[PDB]
């Protein structure tokens, strides 16, 4: 059994991690749990999520850290930083999207990986954003155990993550993503199934 | 101020209502709230949602009823039926997707509207599925104040709903949906913005 922790903060983007969460949690070998600084966080959409783990109470080791976006990432919280930074040290697969990446950039966590994000100009004055690898202008990017993406790439984000964690064969993940993006009828066209 | 109630049951589809919920809730004139039979329901993805209203405790009148899919719609719950059926009587805009539509079909709520769903063969023995309007094989369908869709059409589902409720001009909703489906870079292509 493998564990995926979804780090969500208040006012988190509803649409960003839904494809990854369902794909993973439905597996017998994968478990999805949420972690936050608060026991209850609201999505931008108005949903209230009852968080599984409060930072400092989550399992020491898990297999995937998914940092979803939202409007609360300008956080100086030392507990939060330790939590994420520790995940990097343990070298566990990490995927960040939208606001989450702004957090990574500001705390010098993007300095050794190729990446992308919402808008690089927002980081121009981040004293800790000194990348060796330049910012890539694409929906999502993967470099070793780090996948980044802008808030408009839930599907691209999910695709690269499933690849990174060897979720399934490429000619299987491709189908799942096609179904997600184009729908049953277009899928039925290109696959019949 | 207008209210949208999202009816979610246990093991609900994470990906189906995220675009509609965020689009609506961000508006000053719209509020999104969840309603269920239980105070806490899990999404297929592993998220636990703290429901706003338990059926029987939700506001008597609201502006939109969104019934999201999942694996718990084979429900004989009389409270649930009364709740939905009452919404139909008050003629409030209603949108159903995935499993939710199976519920509509079985309780004779699709007999006077054109519609679609996951698979019509599943309703072949429903004694209450006697439509005047035939089942349409498309991602999503709108007929007056009823929008239906299969589980693979979150975006189509959202598009028709925003249209039904006159959320904005078509040449505005079209852009929002393009952004949702194709991403920033493809959007920037076709609009520059």
Strands (E), chain B: 2-7, 30-36, 40-42, 48-50, 53-54, 64-67, 94-97, 140-143, 146-149
- Measured between beta carbons, the chain B residues lying within 8 angstroms of A47 are 6, 21, 32, 34, 49
Alpha-carbon distance A72 to A34, whole Å? Answer: 16
Report resolution (Å) to 1 decimal: 2.1
Q: Is B112 exposed, middle or buried (0-12, 13-18, 19+ CB in 10 A)?
A: middle
Question: Quick check: A26 and B44 CB within 8 A?
Answer: yes
Nearest alpha carbon to residue A6 among A76, A74, A43, A53? A53
Residue among B3, B10, B15, B47 with most chain A CBs within 10 A, to mutate:
B47
Q: Kindly state the greatest CA–CA separation across chain A.
A: 53
CATH value at residue B69: 3.40.50.880
Q: Which helix (H) or strand (E) holds B100?
A: helix B99-106
Q: How many angstroms away from the CA of B147 is the closest CA of chain A?
A: 17
- For tokens 């009852």, name the residue: A50
Residue A98 annotated to the active site: yes
Alpha-carbon distance A122 to A117, whole Å? Answer: 10
In this structure, are residues B149 and B140 in contact, taking their beta carbons and an 8 Å threshold? yes
Q: How many domains does chain A have?
A: 1
Helices (H), A32-153: 78-89, 99-106
In this structure, are residues A48 and B49 in contact, taking their beta carbons and an 8 Å threshold? yes
Helices (H), chain A: 18-25, 78-89, 99-106, 154-164, 170-182, 184-191
Domain range spanning residue A188? 1-193
Contacts of A170 (CB under 8 A, 6+ apart): A163
The structure was resolved experimentally with X-ray
Q: How many angstroms away from the CA of B104 is the closest CA of chain A?
A: 21
By Cβ distance, the residue of A32, A44, A180 closest to B26 is A44
Out of B23, B80, B98, B109, pick the active-site residue. Answer: B98
**Residue A116, Cβ neighbours under 10 Å: how many?**
22
3-class DSSP state of B142: strand
């Amino acid at each position: 059994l493998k564990k995926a922790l979804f780090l969500i903060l208040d006012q988190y983007a509803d649409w960003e991690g839904v494809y990854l969460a369902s794909a993973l949690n439905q597996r017998e070998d994968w478990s999805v749990h949420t972690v936050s600084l608060d026991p209850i966080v609201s999505s931008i959409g108005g949903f209230k999520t009852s968080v599984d783990y409060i930072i400092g109470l989550e399992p020491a080791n898990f297999n995937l850290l998914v940092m979803i976006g939202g409007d609360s990432w300008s956080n100086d919280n030392k507990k939060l930083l330790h939590f994420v930074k520790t995940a990097f040290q343990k070298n566990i697969p990490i995927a960040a999207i939208c606001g989450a990446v702004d957090f990574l950039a500001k705390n010098g966590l993007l300095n050794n990986h190729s990446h992308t994000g919402n808008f690089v100009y927002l980081w121009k004055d981040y004293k800790q954003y000194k990348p060796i690898s330049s910012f890539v202008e694409k929906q999502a990017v993967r470099d070793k155990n780090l996948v980044t993406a802008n808030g408009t790439a839930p599907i691209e984000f999910t695709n690269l993550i499933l690849e990174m964690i060897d979720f399934d064969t490429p000619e299987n993940i491709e189908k799942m993503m096609y179904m997600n993006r184009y729908g049953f009828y277009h899928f039925c066209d290109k696959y019949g199934n």
